[PDB]
Amino acid sequence: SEESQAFQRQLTALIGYDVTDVSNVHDDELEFTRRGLVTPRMAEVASRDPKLYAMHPWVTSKPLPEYLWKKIANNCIFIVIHRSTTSQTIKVSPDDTPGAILQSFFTKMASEQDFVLRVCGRDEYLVGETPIKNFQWVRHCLKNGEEIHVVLDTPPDPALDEVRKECDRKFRVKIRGIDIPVLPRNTDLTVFVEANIQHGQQVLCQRRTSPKPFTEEVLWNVWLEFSIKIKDLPKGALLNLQIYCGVQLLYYVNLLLIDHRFLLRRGEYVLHMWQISGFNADKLTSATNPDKENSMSISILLDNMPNQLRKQLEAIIATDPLNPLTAEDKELLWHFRYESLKHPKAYPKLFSSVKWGQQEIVAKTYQLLARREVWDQSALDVGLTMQLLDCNFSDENVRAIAVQKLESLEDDDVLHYLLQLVQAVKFEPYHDSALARFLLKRGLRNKRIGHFLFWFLRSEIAQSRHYQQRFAVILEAYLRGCGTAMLHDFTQQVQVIEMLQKVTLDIKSLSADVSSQVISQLKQKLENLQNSQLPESFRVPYDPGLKAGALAIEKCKVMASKKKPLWLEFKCADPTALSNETIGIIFKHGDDLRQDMLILQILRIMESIWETESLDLCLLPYGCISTGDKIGMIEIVKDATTIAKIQQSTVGNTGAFKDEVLNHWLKEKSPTEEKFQAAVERFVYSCAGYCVATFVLGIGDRHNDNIMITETGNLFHIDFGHILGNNKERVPFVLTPDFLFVMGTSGKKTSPHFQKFQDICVKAYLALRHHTNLLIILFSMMLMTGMPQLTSKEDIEYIRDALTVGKNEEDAKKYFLDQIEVCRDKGWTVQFNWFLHLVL
Numbered sequence: 157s158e159e160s161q162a163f164q165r166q167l168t169a170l171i172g173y174d175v176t177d178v179s180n181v182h183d184d185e186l187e188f189t190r191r192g193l194v195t196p197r198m199a200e201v202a203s204r205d206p207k208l209y210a211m212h213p214w215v216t217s218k219p220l221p222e223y224l225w226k227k228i229a230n231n232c233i234f235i236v237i238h239r240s241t242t243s244q245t246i247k248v249s250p251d252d253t254p255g256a257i258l259q260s261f262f263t264k265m266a267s268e269q270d271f272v273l274r275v276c277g278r279d280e281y282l283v284g285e286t287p288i289k290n291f292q293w294v295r296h297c298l299k300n301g302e303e304i305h306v307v308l309d310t311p312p313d314p315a316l317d318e319v320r321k322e323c324d325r326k327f328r329v330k331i332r333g334i335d336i337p338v339l340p341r342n343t344d345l346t347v348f349v350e351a352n353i354q355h356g357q358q359v360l361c362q363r364r365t366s367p368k369p370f371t372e373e374v375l376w377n378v379w380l381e382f383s384i385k386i387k388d389l390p391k392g393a394l395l396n397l398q399i400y401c402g403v404q405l406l407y408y409v410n411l412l413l414i415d416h417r418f419l420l421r422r423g424e425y426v427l428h429m430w431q432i433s434g435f436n437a438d439k440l441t442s443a444t445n446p447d448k449e450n451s452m453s454i455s456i457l458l459d460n461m462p463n464q465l466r467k468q469l470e471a472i473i474a475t476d477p478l479n480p481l482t483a484e485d486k487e488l489l490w491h492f493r494y495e496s497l498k499h500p501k502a503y504p505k506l507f508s509s510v511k512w513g514q515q516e517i518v519a520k521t522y523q524l525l526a527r528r529e530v531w532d533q534s535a536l537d538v539g540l541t542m543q544l545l546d547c548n549f550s551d552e553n554v555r556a557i558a559v560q561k562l563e564s565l566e567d568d569d570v571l572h573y574l575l576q577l578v579q580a581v582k583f584e585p586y587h588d589s590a591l592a593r594f595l596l597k598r599g600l601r602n603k604r605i606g607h608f609l610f611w612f613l614r615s616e617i618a619q620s621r622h623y624q625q626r627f628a629v630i631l632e633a634y635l636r637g638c639g640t641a642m643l644h645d646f647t648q649q650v651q652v653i654e655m656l657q658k659v660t661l662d663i664k665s666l667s668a669d670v671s672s673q674v675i676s677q678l679k680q681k682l683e684n685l686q687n688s689q690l691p692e693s694f695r696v697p698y699d700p701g702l703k704a705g706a707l708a709i710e711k712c713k714v715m716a717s718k719k720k721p722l723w724l725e726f727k728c729a730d731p732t733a734l735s736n737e738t739i740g741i742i743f744k745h746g747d748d749l750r751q752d753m754l755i756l757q758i759l760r761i762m763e764s765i766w767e768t769e770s771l772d773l774c775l776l777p778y779g780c781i782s783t784g785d786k787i788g789m790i791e792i793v794k795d796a797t798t799i800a801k802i803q804q805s806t807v808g809n810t811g812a813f814k815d816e817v818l819n820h821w822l823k824e825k826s827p828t829e830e831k832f833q834a835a836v837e838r839f840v841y842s843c844a845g846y847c848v849a850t851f852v853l854g855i856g857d858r859h860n861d862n863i864m865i866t867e868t869g870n871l872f873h874i875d876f877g878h879i880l881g882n883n884k885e886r887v888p889f890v891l892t893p894d895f896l897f898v899m900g901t902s903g904k905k906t907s908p909h910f911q912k913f914q915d916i917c918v919k920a921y922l923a924l925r926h927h928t929n930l931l932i933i934l935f936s937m938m939l940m941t942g943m944p945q946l947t948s949k950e951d952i953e954y955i956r957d958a959l960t961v962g963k964n965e966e967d968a969k970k971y972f973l974d975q976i977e978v979c980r981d982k983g984w985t986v987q988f989n990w991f992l993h994l995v996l
């Protein structure tokens with residue numbers, strides 16, 4: 157039992173936070189939340205079949221795309237089984253279950269026990285009752301023109317990931333005063349306090365204090381009387397106290413007026429507040445600043461139908477999420493709420509039209525909710541679901557119908573949206589929520605989700621004071637059920653990257669290009685690191701199937717980059733592997749990688765969209781995990797080099813590029829013209845996607861040292877640090893002459909390979925528009941929870957313009973096709989400027 161409090165200190169150092177340390181509380185919610193979560197932990201743990209859990213087959217139920225059938229002939233597929241030296245090679249119909257070849261070997265291909273299949277190099281299996289074309293690896297092996305390879309061998313023990321044993325008065329708030337140990341500001345202003353009663357961003361009522369002289373301490377002793385009545389207070393309503401000084405918002409804090417037990421909140425409070433750098437999901441947190449020594453305090457006290465209408469209505473429900481409802485709109489929605497209830501696409505706007513500070517309306521709402529059979533019968537729409545989980549919605553019951561829909565989703569989709577679901581917790585009123593528990597079950601039900609959940613949650617715990625307590629209670633909850641096997645890996649992973657962050661920082665300090673000492677100085681630390689203290693092997697945090705062991709010391713180097721990042725390379729710890737070729741991770745302090753994760757994941761989202769219309773655009777949305785404060789890792793795509801550096805090779809230090817160089821570099825890397833096609837093939841496709849992807853996301857305009865290509869023609873962008881920073885010469889995105897001559901064209905021409913691009917984009921762009929709503933919610937959500945300095949809605953209204961909302965298919969492609977021209981009619985103009993900016 158003191159061995160039980162030894163392991164709680166394990167739990168702690170994995171999390172990077174102490175979920176017992178009641179330093180920064182003023183109620184029992186976090187604990188109550190620890191307690192509250194034990195049930196769903198134990199439930200899902202129990203429900204889970206430990207065999208399939210231990211092997212976590214990674215499977216989809218989606219159609220095999222119309223782009224990926226055409227890589228098969230005669231509806232059979234090769235699967236090269238291996239053993240100690242031995243190796244056979246079976247034909248297979250793309251429906252053969254893993255079980256449909258337990259007999260095509262131990263019997264047909266030539267008492268006995270049971271042993272099952274595993275991909276070569278990876279902790280990645282082919283088990284359970286799924287077609288063979290429904291395993292994600294196979295589809296990849298196919299997609300990339302690769303060929304399967306697996307190892308017959310013993311299943312992993314289900315005993316390994318064992319889990320350990322176990323009133324009609326108006327509301328009144330007294331403002332006593334505010335206190336700061338030092339008042340940094342030297343111009344003596346005045347300041348007042350603004351008490352806002354709030355619900356999901358709607359202010360319900362607002363009362364200020366009388367301005368006073370600003371001093372290190374200011375007392376008012378005043379009751380502020382609100383017009384709202386207590387009866388009318390809705391669970392989740394937030395008391396938002398804010399310090400203004402004249403005008404400017406310097407400090408905010410929040411207190412859930414109704415506690416996690418539905419109790420009105422009675423008492424004396426001293427609340428430590430957050431300052432305001434220079435909406436945002438941080439403005440919403442029930443967390444108080446844990447830095448009591450520097451933070452400002454406040455001190456408070458609480459004692460206690462026609463045509464045109466149906467038309468009008470439908471024209472409202474047919475707008476985007478970002479379209480702002482007028483009062484007329486709202487009253488119309490509310491009055492016709494029962495008709496509105498028939499269309500699930502109206503749910504967001506409908507519930508946005510509820511007067512939430514009015515007890516009897518909420519009632520009527522809550523009964524309107526009890527008649528959503530139509531909702532309950534609709535096919536899941538992630539966009540819509542998502543949209544009810546955002547900052548605009550703060551009622552449990554509503555928020556719960558959303559989480560209801562997410563329950564349908566198969567694991568392959570949870571993975572797709574996991575990052576943004578995790579961030580969506582930043583908008584939950586309460587630490588315990590349907591969303592948090594839904595993340596939990598799924599976390600525990602499937603090891604893959606489980607892995608990434610850990611890192612997602614841990615990422616935020618490391619660089620958010622506004623949310624580390626809450627995410628920590630959920631992380632702890634996860635770990636208490638993931639099992640000993642994963643506990644193990646997790647602690648292993650944490651060691652490596654801690655071990656390695658150490659190394660990255662020291663190296664920055666030594667530098668402000670490269671030293672002779674610094675390369676061998678690094679070399680010396682990396683030799684010392686391997687010398688004793690590193691794990692025999694660790695799971696690659698962004699590719700969990702893939703264990704890594706020894707450090708190819710000779711190949712690791714400090715990059716000649718802006719900050720000083722470590723190019724590392726690693727030997728694979730898995731003998732059965734298909735190669736000697738290493739695993740390449742970049743480590744980096746200096747940027748916020750949380751922004752890169754977000755954008756990368758959106759990119760994956762954009763792939764899958766295209767999968768629905770059997771498009772494929774060969775993006776490389778590479779691995780990237782934020783792991784701590786301005787510090788995380790990135791996956792190295794092997795064989796790649798940035799455009800900028802393909803410019804130094806032929807042409808050097810500065811200057812406009814030989815529009816041909818790229819293709820020489822290409823033909824230089826194609827061994828056969830019988831491959832080279834595959835290069836400019838890949839390129840024109842890959843070029844297509846990142847152009848669409850970027851303009852849409854508002855990050856197309858980029859220097860070409862931030863744009864890469866593979867020696868097999870695949871092009872991709874990198875480093876998305878604060879590139880969204882808001883009229884000099886501007887280019888919608890990066891389509892430059894070099895990219896063009898590779899197509900085979902000049903400022904007028906039109907190739908058989910260009911028309912293609914000109915065509916294949918427009919296809920890709922309108923494909924995106926079939927999900928206008930989904931992209932808008934994700935992008936909105938991205939700005940509020942990952943890009944600080946994205947204060948304005950003006951920021952958000954980019955995407956709708958970008959996506960040309962409420963417009964005919966055709967006009968759009970004549971919006972888009974022109975965009976490509978601006979880039980044509982610009983060549984290297986803006987690129988040059990970035991050269992004069994990369995030095996200005």
Ligand SMILES: Oc1cccc(-c2nc(N3CCOCC3)nc3c2CCN3c2ccc3[nH]cnc3c2)c1
Nearest residue numbers: 717752778790791792793796797798801874875876
């Ligand atoms: O998303 C991010 C965030 C921060 C840095 C990077 C980054 N990534 C990569 N990758 C990732 C995929 O494999 C190819 C190498 N290379 C990077 C960066 C930032 C700098 N950098 C870089 C810059 C110049 C180079 N010249 C030759 N290789 C280069 C790599 C990416």
